Amino acid sequence: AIISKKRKLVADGVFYAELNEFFTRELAEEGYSGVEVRVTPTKTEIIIRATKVQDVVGENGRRINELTLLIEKRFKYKRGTIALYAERVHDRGLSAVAQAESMKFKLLNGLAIRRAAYGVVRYVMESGAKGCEVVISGKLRAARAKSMKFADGFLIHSGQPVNDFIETATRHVLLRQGVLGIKVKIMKDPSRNTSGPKALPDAVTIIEPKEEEPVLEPSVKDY
Amino acid sequence: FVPVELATTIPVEIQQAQQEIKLFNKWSFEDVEVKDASLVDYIQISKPIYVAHTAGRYANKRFRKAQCPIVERLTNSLMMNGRNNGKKLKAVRIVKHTLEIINVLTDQNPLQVVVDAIINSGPREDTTRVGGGGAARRQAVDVSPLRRVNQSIALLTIGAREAAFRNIKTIAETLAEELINAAKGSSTSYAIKKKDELERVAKSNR
Amino acid sequence: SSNIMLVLRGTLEGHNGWVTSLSTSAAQPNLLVSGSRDKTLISWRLTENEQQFGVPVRSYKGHSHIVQDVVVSADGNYAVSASWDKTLRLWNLATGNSEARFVGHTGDVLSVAIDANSSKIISASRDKTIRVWNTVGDCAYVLLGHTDWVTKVRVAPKNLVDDGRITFVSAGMDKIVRSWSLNSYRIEADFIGHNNYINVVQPSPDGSLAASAGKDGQIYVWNLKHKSAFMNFDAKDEVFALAFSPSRFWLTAATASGIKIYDLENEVLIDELKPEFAGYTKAQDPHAVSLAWSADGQTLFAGYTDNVIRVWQVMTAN
Amino acid sequence: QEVVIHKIRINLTSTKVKQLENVSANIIKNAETFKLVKKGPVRLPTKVLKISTRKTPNGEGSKTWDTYEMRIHKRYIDLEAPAHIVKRITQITIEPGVDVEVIIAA
Amino acid sequence: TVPSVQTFGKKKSATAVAHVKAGKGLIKVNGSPITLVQPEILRFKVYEPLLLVGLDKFANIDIRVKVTGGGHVSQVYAIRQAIAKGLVAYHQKFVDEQSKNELKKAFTSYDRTLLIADSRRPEPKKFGGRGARSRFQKSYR
Amino acid sequence: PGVSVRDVPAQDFINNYASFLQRQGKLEVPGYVDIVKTSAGNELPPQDSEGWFYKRAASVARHIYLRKQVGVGKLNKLYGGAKNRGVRPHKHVDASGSINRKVLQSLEKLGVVEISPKGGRRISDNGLRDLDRIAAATLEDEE
Amino acid sequence: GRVRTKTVKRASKALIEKYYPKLTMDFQTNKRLCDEIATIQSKRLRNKIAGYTTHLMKRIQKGPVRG
RNA sequence: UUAAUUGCGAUAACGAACGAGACCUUAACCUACUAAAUAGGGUUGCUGGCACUUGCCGGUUGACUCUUCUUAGAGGGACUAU
Ligand SMILES: [Mg+2]
């Protein structure tokens, strides 16, 4: 109550960001991807998308409930004005963040890095994306550090179609000799868009004309 | 011929200066002959202007500068030195004053005098720094009419500015004097002197 | 042919675009309402003083795109225009005012047609549909005619005594000319004949004759009251406008080259109209977009791409 | 019973334009359905929130700047109705991202 | 019921809204008559829509201008533009077309800005410089 | 056809008003005259000394006539200019508010200026009449 | 400054090849045709294409052209 | 040739991709829409000052209506067009 409208909006955004950060921190093992916030009448609706839904759920109100409580404690809401909903991230390959997380996990486990990257690329391809680009920056054998670059397919780089179709992810992986950085790009198919433009702006495709046998001298159809 | 008034009554002077002649600040743009073959089409006059302040899109193309009333150009030139820079109203005022001064002395159209000055301070042959390697030796070269006009405009203004540097003689008076000197080729004017020097240099280099 | 050797009189100038349509009122003879690409509408009144056969009266600035077809009412008070901004505007001629804005067409409106009563308006647009309007701004019959563009709709005049149905023909980029009736409220006949693309289908003062022409370089005349096939002329070049006259069995056709004039049933391809221009290279040349005959059968009014409305007059050889 | 016509002002605020427009359309439709005294969706001048940051974290380099801007769309609608009806109208037609706000009463 | 139209004039930021009405022949700027304005040296600019086409057209047309935005010179220009527009507009509406055309011709021959509003608008400033194009002083010692 | 202040060359009108005030003697001079700055960012008091506070008053009155509601702060803002802050760029500095206030008070006393609703000051009918008269006089002089 | 790209010129050429009958001369009509037939994403691009087509048409009515 | 490996061309290369361009934000036009007492007007109430004939400048969210300026939605518009 009684706060400037622009300011309020800003605060909302900030809150959202904070929430996202929190989710990233907590639900890393479950494979968190995205948050949605709906400030409807009475209740605020937080929709979570994670790779492991069951885990998130817990003992049907063990982990989710705890999370809710934490949220309440933090932003100061009533016990019953926050609801949480775990969801399937539809096509895990089309999510860059998820891919990044997976890569990180693999690294932690101790997989061959190049191989892992290749696998990721393959997965992306399967998911049906136009292009994948994976940059792995850091010290990968020997002290003098180098960024390795594993790519396939299309990719754009410049223009406003970048924020439209290219989805990006950056996650830093901690190992006992130094930090790695995993940067993953996915070029989503323009035709399979749902909301927004259905092609790249430069792409012009013309329709084909129909066959003609026209003349054969006047005549009239009558009713 | 025929003064008719309205609801908001206009002063008589304004009424007088209307339909027959489109006067400048307060006298005719007519008469005023370009008394030189060349510098025609490159000195404007012709189109009768009221004030030496139009909006203007004169640096847009290439020769849009040539289709600008000469008075306006003069004003623009005057406008120079960073302390003075901007403030075109002041320049206009100065120009007006100069015109008045000209009218007062030797009569004529002041515009005509100005035109004459412009004509007779534009150098006919210039020298470009062409070395053929890097030596400071110079080469004799012909001058474009537009260039001649432009330089002339610059020179007088510069002279006026110089005169104004520590003087009671308000710039306008100085400018008028310069114009007078130019129109009746004097060698007491600065611009004319400069032109002469340039000519001499050209002659030497040829 | 015989006598009438047409002479250029005036070059009516005051536009900044292609004069795409001109029309004289069904009752009044002195008016000529000129519609153009420069969104304007200039009303011309016949003066008959020196070169100026007509001088401008009223410009109707109220459109955002090309004013394509203009049709005057039965008397000479209302003028209806069809614009490339998806709307039509009904204008009051003596005033300088608009009246009705016609919302409905989901595409640029090409041609307008008012009835002999000035009661029921009908319009064709680059939209695939033809629409029925009234003198308020209200939709009646929405004709789902052609599968491609509709180009020209003009209502035919009738004298032989009443039916309850008024008739018109719909030109298209569909290759098929189609006749309608309105109060069966629907089709009369399909006049399949054109091989390329139709620009103009124009009815005559006769009513039972309606000429069809376009990009084909040919003029296929159709018989209406018998609902049957008829004459086919060659014109070499694309026909931009067709015009019948109250003078003879004349047919005046505006080609891409110039203006070609024929006799209808005694098929002689007679007089051509071409004026002079300044400069110019090869196969360009300003061609006449739209031409109108006066109700007298005396004056040809020809609107050009060069913005000028050129006036041709009847002058007998002897 | 309940029907006493008040003075109702409804505020709409968002960052997404299209969504806001949709919401407005919905509201208008509702109004039409209920056919009441109506003042149109009055549009207030869009508020651009500006930020300027040196692109660098450290400070070294050619001094390059950012212009991170957030545009706010604020639009209001005026209705003369009973309050219950207004509530009913506004309880539905809610899209995530758009803030629906009610002043209610004179 | 009186024949009247609402034409504006724009320069840089300045806007001048002139209401052209049927009547006696008033030309007023911000409530004050045309005879004032008072940058004074630019007074003749505001007179240029009057005297170029003549006071003959002004005998029946009343002009009430409200001027806001810009500076002084710009405002004056805007006012002038508005004045130029207004008569023409009136002619188009309530007089005749030929006359309007003539007026336009008169205007068009002397100065362009009277009908076509000026294209030019301030270029935005960008970083690393004082103005839009002018950078800071770079130094290599 | 009718005269008002809005139809007069401004400076001349102001001068006339000042003259009228002088003739009257009536206003109330507070006695800050020949001591004060006018604007707190100035290098000098007035270059007329004896008077010109009358002139200021007249100007204020004119301003009031022109507008609806005028205050003290606003007046200060109007009348202040750019103070030379030394080897530092100039800034807009508001005029001496007390002087303005005094002027307003004087006007009120006279019966020219009147305290308004919402806040600030407007014009009295007598004041308006006086202004009109002044304008007429100016016009006559011009003629 | 103004030189047309591959994505304009090639497209225009293709259009011409497909639709020389019904793609004629003047600009506005051509533009409309382009809008109807081609699946052009931007407006400006479409406009450019139309312009190019018009130019090509103009060139044609003075002799044949390569490609 | 172009601001551009931008094109026209020449041609053991042919057809492509990234970058450039396209794009997007913004700045320009809109008497054409859709709108407003959180923008501005018009008439008109009451009302203040004028000349004193009707006329001129005013103060008032008193009415009624309008959208040119205003804001901002949807469009259009330039493609180097003729
Ligand atoms: Mg690219």
Ligand SMILES: [Mg+2]
């Ligand atoms: Mg780019």
Ligand SMILES: [Mg+2]
């Ligand atoms: Mg100083």
